[PDB]
Amino acid sequence: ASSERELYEAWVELLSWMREYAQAKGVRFEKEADFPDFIYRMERPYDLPTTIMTASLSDGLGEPFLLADVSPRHAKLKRIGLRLPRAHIHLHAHYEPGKGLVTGKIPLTKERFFALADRAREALAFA
Amino acid sequence: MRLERVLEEARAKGYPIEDNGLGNLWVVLPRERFKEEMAHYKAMGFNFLADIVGLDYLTYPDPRPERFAVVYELVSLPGWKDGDGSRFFVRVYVPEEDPRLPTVTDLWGSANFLEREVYDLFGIVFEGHPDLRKILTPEDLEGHPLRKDYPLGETPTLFREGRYIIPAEFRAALTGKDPGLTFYKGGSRKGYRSLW
Amino acid sequence: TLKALAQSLGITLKYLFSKPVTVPYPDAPVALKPRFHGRHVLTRHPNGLEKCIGCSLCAAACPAYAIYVEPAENDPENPVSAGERYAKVYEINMLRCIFCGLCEEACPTGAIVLGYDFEMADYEYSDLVYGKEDMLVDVVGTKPQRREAKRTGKPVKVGYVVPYVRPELEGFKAPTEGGK
Amino acid sequence: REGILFTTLEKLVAWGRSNSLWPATFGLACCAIEMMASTDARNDLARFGSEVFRASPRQADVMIVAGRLSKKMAPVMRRVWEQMPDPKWVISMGACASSGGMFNNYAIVQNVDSVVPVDVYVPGCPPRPEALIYAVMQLQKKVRGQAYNERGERLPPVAAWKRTRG
Amino acid sequence: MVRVKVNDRIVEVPPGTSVMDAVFHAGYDVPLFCSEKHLSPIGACRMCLVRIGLPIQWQPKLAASCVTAVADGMVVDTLSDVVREAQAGMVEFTLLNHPLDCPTCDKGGACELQDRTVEYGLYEKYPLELPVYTRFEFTRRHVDKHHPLSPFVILDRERCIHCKRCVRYFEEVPGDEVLDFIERGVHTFIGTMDFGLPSGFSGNITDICPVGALLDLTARFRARNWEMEETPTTCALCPV
Amino acid sequence: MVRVGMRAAPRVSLEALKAALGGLKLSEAKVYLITDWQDKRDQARYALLLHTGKKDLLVPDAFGPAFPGGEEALSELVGLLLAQGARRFYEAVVSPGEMTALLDLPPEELLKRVMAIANPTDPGIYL
Amino acid sequence: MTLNVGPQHPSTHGVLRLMVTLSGEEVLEVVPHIGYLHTGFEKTMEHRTYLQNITYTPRMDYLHSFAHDLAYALAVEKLLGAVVPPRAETIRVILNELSRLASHLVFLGTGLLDLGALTPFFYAFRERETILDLFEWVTGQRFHHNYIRIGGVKEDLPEEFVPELKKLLEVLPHRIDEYEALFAESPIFYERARGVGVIPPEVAIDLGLTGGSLRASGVNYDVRKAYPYSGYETYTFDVPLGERGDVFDRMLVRIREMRESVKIIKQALERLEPGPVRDPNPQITPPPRHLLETSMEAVIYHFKHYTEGFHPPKGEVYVPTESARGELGYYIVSDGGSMPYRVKVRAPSFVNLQSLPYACKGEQVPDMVAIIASLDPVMGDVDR
Numbered sequence A: 001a002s003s004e005r006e007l008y009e010a011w012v013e014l015l016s017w018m019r020e021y022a023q024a025k026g027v028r029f030e031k032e033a034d035f036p037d038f039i040y041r042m043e044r045p046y047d048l049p050t051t052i053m054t055a056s057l058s059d060g061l062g063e064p065f066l067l068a069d070v071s072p073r074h075a076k077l078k079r080i081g082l083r084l085p086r087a088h089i090h091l092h093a094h095y096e097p098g099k100g101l102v103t104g105k106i107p108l109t110k111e112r113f114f115a116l117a118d119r120a121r122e123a124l125a126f127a
Numbered sequence B: 001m002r003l004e005r006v007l008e009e010a011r012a013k014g015y016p017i018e019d020n021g022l023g024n025l026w027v028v029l030p031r032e033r034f035k036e037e038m039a040h041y042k043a044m045g046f047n048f049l050a051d052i053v054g055l056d057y058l059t060y061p062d063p064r065p066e067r068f069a070v071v072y073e074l075v076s077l078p079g080w081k082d083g084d085g086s087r088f089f090v091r092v093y094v095p096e097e098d099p100r101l102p103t104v105t106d107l108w109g110s111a112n113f114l115e116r117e118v119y120d121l122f123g124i125v126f127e128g129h130p131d132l133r134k135i136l137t138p139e140d141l142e143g144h145p146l147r148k149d150y151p152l153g154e155t156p157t158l159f160r161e162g163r164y165i166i167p168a169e170f171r172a173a174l175t176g177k178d179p180g181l182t183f184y185k186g187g188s189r190k191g192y193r194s195l196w
Numbered sequence C: 001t002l003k004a005l006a007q008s009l010g011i012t013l014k015y016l017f018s019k020p021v022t023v024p025y026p027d028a029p030v031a032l033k034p035r036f037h038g039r040h041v042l043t044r045h046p047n048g049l050e051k052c053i054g055c056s057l058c059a060a061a062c063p064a065y066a067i068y069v070e071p072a073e074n075d076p077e078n079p080v081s082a083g084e085r086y087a088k089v090y091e092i093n094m095l096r097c098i099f100c101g102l103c104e105e106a107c108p109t110g111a112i113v114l115g116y117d118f119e120m121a122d123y124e125y126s127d128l129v130y131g132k133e134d135m136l137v138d139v140v141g142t143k144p145q146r147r148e149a150k151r152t153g154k155p156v157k158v159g160y161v162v163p164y165v166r167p168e169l170e171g172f173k174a175p176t177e178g179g180k
Numbered sequence D: 001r002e003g004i005l006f007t008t009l010e011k012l013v014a015w016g017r018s019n020s021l022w023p024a025t026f027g028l029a030c031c032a033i034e035m036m037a038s039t040d041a042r043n044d045l046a047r048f049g050s051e052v053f054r055a056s057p058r059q060a061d062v063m064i065v066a067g068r069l070s071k072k073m074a075p076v077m078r079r080v081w082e083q084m085p086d087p088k089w090v091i092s093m094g095a096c097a098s099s100g101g102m103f104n105n106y107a108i109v110q111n112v113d114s115v116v117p118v119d120v121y122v123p124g125c126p127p128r129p130e131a132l133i134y135a136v137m138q139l140q141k142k143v144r145g146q147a148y149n150e151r152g153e154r155l156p157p158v159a160a161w162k163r164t165r166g
Numbered sequence E: 001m002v003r004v005k006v007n008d009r010i011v012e013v014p015p016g017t018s019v020m021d022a023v024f025h026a027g028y029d030v031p032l033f034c035s036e037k038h039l040s041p042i043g044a045c046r047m048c049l050v051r052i053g054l055p056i057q058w059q060p061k062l063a064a065s066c067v068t069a070v071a072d073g074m075v076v077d078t079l080s081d082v083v084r085e086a087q088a089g090m091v092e093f094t095l096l097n098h099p100l101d102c103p104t105c106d107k108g109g110a111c112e113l114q115d116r117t118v119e120y121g122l123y124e125k126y127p128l129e130l131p132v133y134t135r136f137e138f139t140r141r142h143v144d145k146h147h148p149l150s151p152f153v154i155l156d157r158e159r160c161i162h163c164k165r166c167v168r169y170f171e172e173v174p175g176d177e178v179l180d181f182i183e184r185g186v187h188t189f190i191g192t193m194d195f196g197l198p199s200g201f202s203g204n205i206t207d208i209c210p211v212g213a214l215l216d217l218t219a220r221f222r223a224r225n226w227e228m229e230e231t232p233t234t235c236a237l238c239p240v
Numbered sequence F: 001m002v003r004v005g006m007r008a009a010p011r012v013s014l015e016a017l018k019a020a021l022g023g024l025k026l027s028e029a030k031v032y033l034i035t036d037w038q039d040k041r042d043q044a045r046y047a048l049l050l051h052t053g054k055k056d057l058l059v060p061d062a063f064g065p066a067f068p069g070g071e072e073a074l075s076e077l078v079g080l081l082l083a084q085g086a087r088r089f090y091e092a093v094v095s096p097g098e099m100t101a102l103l104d105l106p107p108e109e110l111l112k113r114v115m116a117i118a119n120p121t122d123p124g125i126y127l
Numbered sequence G: 001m002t003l004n005v006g007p008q009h010p011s012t013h014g015v016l017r018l019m020v021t022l023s024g025e026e027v028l029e030v031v032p033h034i035g036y037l038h039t040g041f042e043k044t045m046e047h048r049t050y051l052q053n054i055t056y057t058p059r060m061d062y063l064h065s066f067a068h069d070l071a072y073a074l075a076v077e078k079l080l081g082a083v084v085p086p087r088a089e090t091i092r093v094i095l096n097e098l099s100r101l102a103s104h105l106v107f108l109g110t111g112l113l114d115l116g117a118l119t120p121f122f123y124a125f126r127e128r129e130t131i132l133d134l135f136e137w138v139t140g141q142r143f144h145h146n147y148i149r150i151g152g153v154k155e156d157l158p159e160e161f162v163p164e165l166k167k168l169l170e171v172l173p174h175r176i177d178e179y180e181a182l183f184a185e186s187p188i189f190y191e192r193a194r195g196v197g198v199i200p201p202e203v204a205i206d207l208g209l210t211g212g213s214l215r216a217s218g219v220n221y222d223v224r225k226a227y228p229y230s231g232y233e234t235y236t237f238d239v240p241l242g243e244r245g246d247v248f249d250r251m252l253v254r255i256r257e258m259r260e261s262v263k264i265i266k267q268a269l270e271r272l273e274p275g276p277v278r279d280p281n282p283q284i285t286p287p288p289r290h291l292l293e294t295s296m297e298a299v300i301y302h303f304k305h306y307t308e309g310f311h312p313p314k315g316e317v318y319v320p321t322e323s324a325r326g327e328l329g330y331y332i333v334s335d336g337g338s339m340p341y342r343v344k345v346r347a348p349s350f351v352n353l354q355s356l357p358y359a360c361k362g363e364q365v366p367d368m369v370a371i372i373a374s375l376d377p378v379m380g381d382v383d384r
């Protein structure tokens, strides 16, 4: 259905949150990868709000501790996924209308993500 | 009708008959029997002598009998007196250090120019020729271009500020002896053919 | 066959009274097809980011080898291309270029696409190497045309008209058949 | 006397030579058919004054290198240029003539500025008849002294005036 | 010596010979990802699979020619439609989560996966019927990208196809185990807690990686593999 | 084939070539001025290969305006070759890096390559 | 008088040198000197990928070039087993016969101008100009068009191509009938050409004169009829023939060729039903431009195909076709590599020139020009 739109739109919000943490805790954030189905569109149309698909929070020593990814514009089983490297931690987040962003049935609030990122920072970061 | 009798004649004398699954026929005659056999071929009713294509196999990946090879094309026009339409090729190898060949200019005048070209492009001198004079390449040009040990002789491409290209160092395409940019080339880049 | 002289005379006269057929360049705009092979243009995405990712697929498939591409790595703050790679130096020697469409055909990002300018006559070999900033879609006119408009103070008018510009030329602004 | 040494007369004679440019065709290859098409009844270089076409070289000022210049033809064309009156101009037409073109080998002169002094270069394969009109107009304003290059310089009226013939 | 037969050709070959060397020795070809010269073969990429008969008694499953020894009088089949079909399938499984980074990939033309894919991939299925390249249309694997492992080496864990060449090298050749995987399953990725890449022979993996994962920082983004002018010479910094 | 003259010494190259030339008649000889960068002659450097047919002569890259007195020495050189009756003049365009290794290749290879790549030239561009 | 009718002077179109061994106003014998355009296709093509060489192919015969493109394409298709879609085949025969009409127009315009009158050069050229627009419609180029591909053609026909083609096909028959009405009932050309140009079919066969000049002497030998390649088996066709080989019969037979070629253009136009455009085999065809952002195989195949190319199997091949100047063919030797091992071209204008000393022997000195224009050489084809 049309929920698709808000998904990518919601994705941008997510990035803001991520960006915020870098400005908050003074730790390096990086745009990892943009959308290939946006680079290789030559004349074809592209309506999505952003072209950035993957980003991460890297410590001083460069190894990321938090990874976030989104399904491409034409891929099936569209979702957003999260991962903690070295910690075997993965999340499958969807967006349920009216409620908000939900990990299954549990809404994903900004506070939840912020606490998760801080736990990762204290645990996995080397320097 | 005459092509079948050509095959029956040559196979009876033990000359190899080359055939690809595409519909073109090669008949390789040795040097001695070449002149007399092809004279008999013209007598067999071959009006038209289309091509004289000279070949240098110096850099061919698989080895071949001899380096140079001259191929004539004998045809009988379908719309002329009694035209079957029989067209075929005659290949005759010429050694690297023996660039000889008797001409069929006396039979077809078409070998006047054509053989000269093969003498111009390759080191092959045609015996019995009225005039073996360089046709295409400049009169002061030294050598025979189309043989692989003869350079193509390229010039670099030019750009703004010291930025140049040497195309022979720029080519990503592979020849037959080029191993490739990886350890090797196998599979579909060593030869690929669809099965209709 | 004396009649043939008279018939020839008569038809030549009939054409004499038939005035029209010709087109007077430069006074009349040359009618070009939308698929015409002209000066290359580098196209940009809606984001403004440039489409060229500096991959040198245009240069290898060039039968004259006239295309030069030095790459570089994007600056995350102010990126130039979409990926991690852009074209620092993009030169095409129009005296080597033979106008195939092989660089257009092989460009995966749709950046390099032929335009419509043919009015690129110049005096010097060294000046006929058209660069990156000499072909962008934003630019309106050829090198001698822009130099003449600058040393003349009079704006550029291209001497061609097309029924429409292709979708591959998104952003290519040109005179279209008289719509303006 | 070279069409110089008078504030009025040099303008007058440059006007004359520039507008009355009389091409001397040297039809070589597929560029030359695009040179012929620039005279038919749709797009004719038969207006600026180039209606007539002096095949003899003793009578024409503009020589257009139109096609691939194979080496066996280099010297002949050379003398065709030397068989021209001194007030003569040479345009290099095409990619095969301007540079080596795509044929980068033993058979082609990789820039015809080698054998003849080029006035105007015109890329294209073949350069559209309308690009040829643009080049003859380029040369028109060049021989009036109305031509400037990218580097900021005004270009001499007649190229082949600066070469120590031999 | 041992007598071996590949599809029409018979070769004398010393006994300890691997089926892969004997196949290439006979003039035929088969993909190769997991194994590498001077590296211990362990069957991982499963590309070198051939058919084997040892008398006409064909083996049940395709033999890994990378880690299999040869025996006298053995028949090896690499041209049967079964072999090419299976090879195309494994190429698809390898290309599964690849980032689509070829055009900006520093590996360019000298990439083994590209060449073996165009060699053995897309078996001719049986017309003028329109073909589909990939079946996998799901969300692909995304991990950390352009990760500098050392001032000379850069690491893209997405391009890794999970061979063993770099970790096997580091364990075997220099004796410096400073690179190995972290997690398992499809989440596996190369990483280290030794960051400086202490081994002084670290640069050789730069050549071995059949993908653009480990690349040269000091030569990053200068030209494509073909655009470079390759001149073979000898290094005179030291007496070796 | 002899190698006279020296790199980047236009006047010494010219004097040694004066001496080694002698009264050699150049009616059927060939003069190959090898350089890089076709168009820009104002900054050109030049080598010379003289193919007489009976013995050949080499001059390294020492002439041209790129060196002090290379323009005047190249003018004198072309005047000297023209005085002796030369009619067939050629120019070879090599990559700069070639120019150095081309004088160290065996005579047959170097000379074959040069004759294949030669461009007929008007000596007026060097006088 | 061994007179030097030099290269390009006087008005020997297609630069060619002639030593006319000749005393008076007769013609004893003409000794030709060619090679003044030698550029090196047979050699340069050995260093260009099969995909690239389609940029080298049309430029040999720059008038009827799509025959060169089609000959090269078909030979490689046979060598690697490519499939012609019906629509691609119909489009290829359209462009073939249309480039043939254009080459014929240029040939007769040049022949009339070369000795005689100037006017009818323009009218025929007018039509030629229109034809070029059609090409510029689909290929974006006047000639030297790089459109054909090994599998088929590059991309599809625009919406605007077919109506313009219908316009030109409706106006042309009257135009060709007008040229023939002017020329056939020849006022002076009758006393100029009917006698000149002695073409005994026996020696024309012996010297390799295939280019439509032989059937003007009454030999029904056409590759479109002798060796159908591009579907010509499936066409209703009149095959022009001549009573006795001269310049007059040659020109009239070629005009009838133009009318039959227009009829073939219309015939092929009618049978055109939408469909595919090129051989979809990914090993031979680059991926479509739209799934470059979805599939990995797409990107790998695009990268490889446009840097390396493809590798056809080891073997030699050759297939002939009929151009406006006769039998044409490419002898392709491939060693299994990305670049062809050798390409040898049977240049019809090359051997068709052997009949110069013969045909114009005993003819007039001026008529040595009309008999060359009537021989229809394209020195891009001869010199090559």
Ligand SMILES: COc1oc([C@H]2C/C(=C/C(C)=C/c3ccc([N+](=O)[O-])cc3)CO2)c(C)c(=O)c1C
Pocket: D025, D026, D027, D028, D029, D030, D032, D033, D036, D039, D051, D052, D053, G011, G012, G013, G014, G015, G110, G377, G378, G379, G380
């Ligand atoms: C003739 O055809 C051709 O020519 C050429 C060359 C020679 C040439 C001559 C003249 C005389 C042009 C000319 C035409 C008309 C006028 N005019 O004033 O009307 C003036 C000059 C132009 O190209 C080539 C190369 C060719 O391959 C063919 C098939």
Ligand code: SF4
Pocket: C058, C061, C062, C063, C064, C065, C066, C067, C092, C096, C097, C098, C099, C100, C101, C102, C103, C104
């Ligand atoms: S159009 Fe052709 S010659 Fe021109 S730059 Fe592109 S690929 Fe090269």
Ligand code: SF4
Pocket: C051, C052, C053, C054, C055, C056, C057, C058, C059, C069, C087, C103, C106, C107, C108, C109, C110, C111, C112
């Ligand atoms: S213009 Fe296109 S093909 Fe060329 S380097 Fe840029 S992105 Fe690649």
Ligand code: SF4
Pocket: D029, D030, D031, D066, D067, D068, D093, D094, D095, D096, D097, D101, D124, D125, D126, D127, G059, G144
């Ligand atoms: S630039 Fe093109 S059209 Fe001109 S001569 Fe060369 S190949 Fe022919």
Ligand code: SF4
Pocket: E098, E099, E100, E101, E102, E103, E105, E106, E107, E108, E111, E112, E113, E114, E159, E210, E211, E212, E213, G300
């Ligand atoms: S590693 Fe190879 S297949 Fe993967 S993106 Fe790079 S070039 Fe393409």
Ligand code: SF4
Pocket: E159, E160, E161, E162, E163, E164, E165, E166, E167, E190, E205, E208, E209, E210, E211, E213, E214
């Ligand atoms: S990083 Fe490269 S060498 Fe190491 S396991 Fe992955 S693909 Fe193999």
Ligand code: FES
Pocket: E031, E032, E033, E034, E035, E041, E042, E043, E044, E045, E046, E047, E048, E049, E064, E065, E066, E067
């Ligand atoms: S080579 Fe990797 S499986 Fe044998």
